[PDB]
Amino acid sequence: ELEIEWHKFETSEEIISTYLIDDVLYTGVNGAVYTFSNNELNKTGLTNNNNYITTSIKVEDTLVCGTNNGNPKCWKIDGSEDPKYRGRGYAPYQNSKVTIISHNECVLSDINISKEGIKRWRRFDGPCGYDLYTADNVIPKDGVRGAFVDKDGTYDKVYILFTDTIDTKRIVKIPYIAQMCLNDEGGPSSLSSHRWSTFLKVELECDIDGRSYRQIIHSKAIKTDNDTILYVFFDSPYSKSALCTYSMNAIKHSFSTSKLGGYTKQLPSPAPGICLPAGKVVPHTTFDIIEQYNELDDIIKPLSQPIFEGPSGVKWFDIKEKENEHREYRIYFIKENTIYSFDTKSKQTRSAQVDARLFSVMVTSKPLFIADIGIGVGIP
Amino acid sequence: EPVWRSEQAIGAIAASQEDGVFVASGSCLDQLDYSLEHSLSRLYRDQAGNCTEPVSLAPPARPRPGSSFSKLLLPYREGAAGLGGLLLTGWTFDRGACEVRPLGNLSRNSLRNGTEVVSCHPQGSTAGVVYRAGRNNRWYLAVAATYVLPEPETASRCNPAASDHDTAIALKDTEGRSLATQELGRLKLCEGAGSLHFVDAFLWNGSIYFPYYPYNYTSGAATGWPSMARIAQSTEVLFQGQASLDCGHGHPDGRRLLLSSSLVEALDVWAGVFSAAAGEGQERRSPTTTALCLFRMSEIQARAKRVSWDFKTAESHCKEGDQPERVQPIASSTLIHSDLTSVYGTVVMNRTVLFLGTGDGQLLKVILGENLTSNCPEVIYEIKEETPVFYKLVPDPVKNIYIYLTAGKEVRRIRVANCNKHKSCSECLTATDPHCGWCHSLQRCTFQGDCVHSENLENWLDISSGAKKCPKIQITVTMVGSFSPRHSKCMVKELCQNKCTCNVMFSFGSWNLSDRLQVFYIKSIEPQKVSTLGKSNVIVTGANFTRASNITMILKGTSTCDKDVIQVSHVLNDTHMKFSLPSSRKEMKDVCIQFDGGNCSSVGSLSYIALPHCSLIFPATTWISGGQNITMMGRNFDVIDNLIISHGNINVSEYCVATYCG
């Protein structure tokens, strides 16, 4: 059961992105950007030629970047101009799905940097160092589906989830998680000087009854006491989708200990995925290995629960820990027209119909649902 | 004539503005004084002290690209306010490493290192140029090289990672750590044409040009048109175009190798030495294989279309679109020649001077005319060993009357004008050599700096005045032209006057002047190696050699110099006739024979040859009885008429081929 109150726009404005910046909702739409907070929907127009606003990251001010008519360009929050004139790798050249995260002041994104569009995963210039980019064909043309930053004890690391499409005898999709060192310095050489030197990846695995799911929809890493737990949502070309959970501690341990797939010899002293003390640069042997064989000979198996299967075609999902109990969540996952909630404790799924073209669910303290009608806020 | 001999063949050479001449020979890189006398300093890149080439490099066919270990060597930032100049040197060793260093005492610490900057394949091409780019005008370095060569042995793996596999041009930054290349600061490649060989890189009108040509390092044959890739002079590669250069005029299959390049700066004219595949060393070496072609930089700048022919573009596929436009050289200037190896163009007194280096140790300069028409080249200097001139000539920066000719393993500093042979005005002024002018105070044809010691500038009469403007006697007699002093004394024989005054004599304070149909078949022609002094007797064998009155032989060596037209000496048997060839310059002239009337019958090539210098005598001593076949090793022995043994003379036989004979 769910009662949602609707703060709608004046018109049905095609949603293009939704972000949470310090419990303030930033809904990038065509034309303006909407700002939800305290049930207050402040719309701010920027331009309207094409200008699909897609990015609303926060570095120092929450700058907001869009694509004004095939030219990507940023702004300050209130339509003002960006001092640093950011905007190349911050917004796509055309309306697309993006993945752009911002740590302290360090923007990482998969957004296309040029017009042609070779897919790469980049960290842009800032406190971490100069720009970086993954070698080609590493990131699939579909893009990076999830990205989040997590401590590795002492060094920040960036994790990204994507779905590769291998094609040898038949096309097989494979879900991957990939780790990189947030403060990587680049490779050793001059050509490989702006390339990640700590990029590694493992296959995930979400099997239930011999049906293995392989297409990532969306991810979210909740931070708990002993470690953080990663919730992935897989879709399938069949009529099903499946939420799995993985223990980031198990993943980190696997990254640090497992062996590189296809590489049989002894791994060098600064082990490939390992972060390095500030200013250090990966040697050449380690880098040659880490670029040739960048996949561990392993497979991350999910936690025991909650694995569950919902409909096919879910688009978003967000978690909200129940205030009464603890480590028991309500996972609100959203389809084009129908809300669904799932309680990790009772393992029952509730549903609800809503006559709108939903786009996302965000959760700050109460699930707010971003649909083309406008925003809604939910109370059961 | 100061020479500096290295031990291994020169790999590169640059000349700093005020810090001497850097020469990268083997594993070691030396710096010398502009007089090429003392190695002021020296760096060892591979191993200390021992700077022998780690591996052996085969000096290949003169048309084929050479090989070395010092890919990049270029000074920059020199002549700054207080900042001492820098020298950027990139070697094959260490995966094609490149270090910035202070331009000066070589044994100082390299400021910034960097790996995979230059091609680490000793026979791979590399050409770089620094420039100003960025929001703060840093010094960037655009490097075009042959990074990936399909010759990797499992022992050592040069070829960079699979991401940087098809990289041709990269815009390194000389400030970032290890000379970092941006993501977009690199220009990819199309993998179909084999490899590319880049010859040069220069800036012109806000852009960088890379003259290259496709090439098969395995085969050894060009696989396409010599082209020029034009890139925007920025921080990220902005491919602005590519244009092929069509210098195959005067040769059947065309000239598809680019042997050397040079941008005539003040004229906005590129000048390139093209050649066709000359078999194996010299087997298809024709009278027209090499050709100096001049292109207007404006035409290349305008005709270069961004087509994905050799380089990947973001808007097409490899060779799935237009073909690059073929730019035509300045027609009135192309100089055909049997063996050309290097070019260097400059402008002095508003006249283009193109020094050229031939594959037989000649440095000969041409002076372009009014409509950039080439004159017949004067031979400036000749290397006694006929070693092929290294493909880069560097002008002395501190004395603009010298140039540093590199050849094999020897560098030397030679003047740019052999004006001591001119003894009069006209000889000094009709030759139209811009560097040379008449000098009254000395009364000699000399450079400017060698005779502007008298402050009255008109003492050193140059060519811009005109050849007629030297002093002469005019009839009521007077002096005409441009004299240095305004006071003289005339004396005729016997009226005398003084000064601008009035046998005839005009004496000055520093100098003086005084004055009182059937067929016609050609079997062959012999010999085919005539020495430079000509040959009195060249036998042409054929048929029906008596059914004709006026039979002529026309030799043409250089598409600019005139033709040697001669009549038959004494018409022998209707199968044989005999000619007499005069002196000429070392060349490989084409020989047509035109009978009483008609087209020329091209009998075949005929090469003048340098005089035979005598290297060594194998036994060097034999018993007074003699009879031991003394062996003499030398060069150009095949052209020897015969031998003399002077002590009384003794005629003795000879059994010889090109290089040696007993």
Ligand SMILES: *[C@@H]1O[C@H](CO)[C@@H](O)[C@H](O)[C@H]1NC(C)=O
């Ligand atoms: C929304 O706009 C009103 C209009 O002035 C302003 O008073 C209010 O502070 C704004 N709230 C946010 C969260 O931007």
Ligand SMILES: *[C@@H]1O[C@H](CO)[C@@H](O)[C@H](O)[C@H]1NC(C)=O
């Ligand atoms: C110099 O080093 C090369 C390395 O290949 C070696 O072959 C040569 O013998 C060395 N010469 C001396 C004098 O050390």
Ligand SMILES: *[C@@H]1O[C@H](CO)[C@@H](O)[C@H](O)[C@H]1NC(C)=O
């Ligand atoms: C170069 O520096 C070294 C280092 O001390 C010194 O020994 C040498 O004399 C210097 N040579 C020149 C020409 O400056």
Ligand SMILES: *[C@@H]1O[C@H](CO)[C@@H](O)[C@H](O)[C@H]1NC(C)=O
């Ligand atoms: C190569 O770079 C490293 C890093 O600074 C430096 O220690 C080393 O001296 C460099 N090598 C040369 C030959 O300059």
Ligand SMILES: *[C@@H]1O[C@H](CO)[C@@H](O)[C@H](O)[C@H]1NC(C)=O
């Ligand atoms: C020409 O180049 C291609 C590609 O590099 C190579 O496969 C081929 O062998 C070369 N030609 C010869 C005669 O080897």
Ligand SMILES: *[C@@H]1O[C@H](CO)[C@@H](O)[C@H](O)[C@H]1NC(C)=O
């Ligand atoms: C220099 O480049 C500009 C850029 O378009 C061009 O218009 C101009 O013609 C160039 N200069 C010459 C002399 O061609």
Ligand SMILES: *[C@@H]1O[C@H](CO)[C@@H](O)[C@H](O)[C@H]1NC(C)=O
């Ligand atoms: C013609 O005479 C020359 C010598 O003058 C001789 O070598 C040649 O064999 C003769 N040929 C014929 C066909 O008689």
Ligand SMILES: *[C@@H]1O[C@H](CO)[C@@H](O)[C@H](O)[C@H]1NC(C)=O
């Ligand atoms: C000594 O005799 C050998 C025998 O062939 C010869 O090659 C050499 O030139 C002679 N003279 C020397 C070694 O000075």
Ligand SMILES: *[C@@H]1O[C@H](CO)[C@@H](O)[C@H](O)[C@H]1NC(C)=O
């Ligand atoms: C002397 O040697 C040369 C080649 O070395 C040979 O052609 C010649 O016939 C020899 N003479 C005698 C008399 O053996």
